[PDB]
Every structure is written in C-alpha cells, then in structure tokens.
Amino acid sequence: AGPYAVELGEAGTFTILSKSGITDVYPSTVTGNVGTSPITGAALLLNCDEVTGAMYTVDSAGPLPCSINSPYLLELAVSDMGIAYNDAAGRVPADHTELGTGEIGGLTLEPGVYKWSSDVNISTDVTFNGTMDDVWIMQISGNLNQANAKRVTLTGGALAKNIFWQVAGYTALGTYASFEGIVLSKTLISVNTGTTVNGRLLAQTAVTLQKNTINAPTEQYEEA
C-alpha cells in the first residue's frame, strides 16, 4: 500500500551522512557507517569508539585511527542522498494534505503520501500501521519537531526503512524520545540528549547528536 519506496543509492549504506559535519556530545553509539562530504574530515567530530561501522572522510583529516579517506564513495553517497530527497519531495498524488494542521501526535497513519505546507510537530506519540511492504512518504515544507519523551511507533509489520521524512526545513528531535525512519533533511538534523533513532540521518547540512543511540533500520522484522 501507498507509494513505492524511495531509492537511496549509495546513501543507503550510511546511518549518518551529511555535507557539513557531524557533531556530538559524547557518548553516542552509532551502529552503521557515517560520513560527511564535501567538507573536510576535520568536521566529523565523532570518536572512533562511538561508531560500530566505518567512518568515511573526504581526506585524511578525520578521526584517528578509524576514519577512511574515501572521497569518491562519499561523492556518490551525497549525490544519491540529493536524488532521494528530490524523489521523495515529488511523489504524487498526496493521499492526505495538512493532516492535523501539522500536529500528527495522537494519530495512526496508514501507508500513503502525506503532505504539509507547514511545520510538522510530533507533540504526543504517533503510530504508523501497515505491513512490512507498505510505505509512507512524509513531505514537509516546514521543519519537523519531535517533543521530548515522545515516540514514533511502528505496528502491523511497518518497517522504519519504509518511512521517508522529506523535510525542507530542519529536523529537531527532543530528549529521551524515539524516532523511526529515513530523514532526508534539506538542512540540519539535531537529535537531543538520550534519544534513539532507528533510521538513517541524511542531511544536506550538518547532523548534531547528543548522547544518542542511532541504529541503521533493519531489512526485516528486528531491532525493536
């Protein structure tokens, strides 16, 4: 049900990919690969002990000892991230428009294309219900804000890898929250203290983490 998946290309191998750096208030745990490009590896400020996969940089200025000078792989990933963002933004028709006038807390969302010409807030828990094949594309022209202690909940077999948040503003998640899905942010993605994300944080500017657990989303029924 709903639209077809958004193909991520080489971006889909990263748990965090940004263009202008990754910041962190230690300690966070990122299970997956991270990278940043075209900015120097000096702007990737995670510690090698916070990443269980690979850390890629454009140069040899990134974290030691683990970072990998891999500018071409990163160029492809960053390219595919921008293709993904535009693919998601362009899907049609929208199944719902202006749902909740941008407040989605307190809703169960069926598979579909959702569009808001505003900011979107998750001020209380929000649920995504469908099977493992269903897809949600969230087209947000404002900013995406999740309130402290709130959650994106998955039911029915819904997978985080199938939920696409296309955010033309910034994405800011509060503290001690739990978030699911692929964030294709045009600008920054900020994740506040203690929050868990099962998903991918794909920002066209920077990613900022504060004591978070960031997990790549699983291929089939797991990690919850």
Side-chain angles (χ1 to χ4, degrees):
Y4 26 117
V6 170
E7 294 313 316
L8 303 180
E10 289 313 324
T13 54
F14 290 86
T15 299
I16 305 173
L17 182 63
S18 72
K19 294 188 57 177
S20 80
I22 300 177
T23 66
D24 178 64
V25 174
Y26 187 91
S28 284
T29 296
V30 180
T31 299
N33 306 310
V34 307
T36 195
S37 164
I39 202 141
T40 169
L44 207 177
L45 304 173
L46 280 160
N47 190 290
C48 286
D49 56 39
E50 302 173 277
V51 182
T52 66
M55 186 186 290
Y56 289 105
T57 58
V58 307
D59 58 15
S60 58
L64 305 168
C66 73
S67 63
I68 294 154
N69 191 337
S70 209
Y72 196 75
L73 170 44
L74 278 161
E75 192 181 338
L76 296 177
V78 169
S79 276
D80 286 342
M81 160 175 65
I83 293 157
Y85 176 99
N86 286 323
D87 176 23
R91 296 301 187 85
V92 282
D95 291 281
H96 309 87
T97 65
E98 314 309 359
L99 185 59
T101 67
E103 170 64 54
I104 55 169
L107 299 177
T108 293
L109 301 186
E110 50 167 31
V113 175
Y114 293 78
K115 175 181 292 292
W116 290 268
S117 70
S118 57
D119 297 332
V120 164
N121 295 296
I122 295 162
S123 301
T124 61
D125 296 355
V126 59
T127 305
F128 289 78
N129 184 71
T131 71
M132 68 249 66
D133 297 321
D134 290 330
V135 171
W136 295 254
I137 300 178
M138 324 291 295
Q139 296 171 340
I140 298 158
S141 82
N143 304 310
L144 171 60
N145 272 280
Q146 181 177 36
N148 299 337
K150 305 308 185 182
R151 296 190 187 172
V152 168
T153 293
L154 304 184
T155 65
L159 302 177
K161 77 165 199 197
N162 289 330
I163 295 176
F164 303 89
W165 304 88
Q166 172 266 310
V167 183
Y170 56 78
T171 296
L173 310 185
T175 55
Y176 302 108
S178 188
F179 188 91
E180 303 282 336
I182 305 297
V183 189
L184 292 155
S185 182
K186 180 107 286 206
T187 64
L188 74 55
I189 300 164
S190 166
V191 192
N192 276 359
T193 304
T195 289
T196 294
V197 171
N198 290 304
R200 299 183 189 283
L201 301 181
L202 309 175
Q204 289 178 43
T205 65
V207 177
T208 72
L209 303 177
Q210 295 172 5
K211 304 180 169 160
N212 302 122
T213 298
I214 311 293
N215 300 315
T218 54
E219 282 314 315
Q220 40 173 31
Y221 221 52
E222 289 152 302
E223 100 196 297

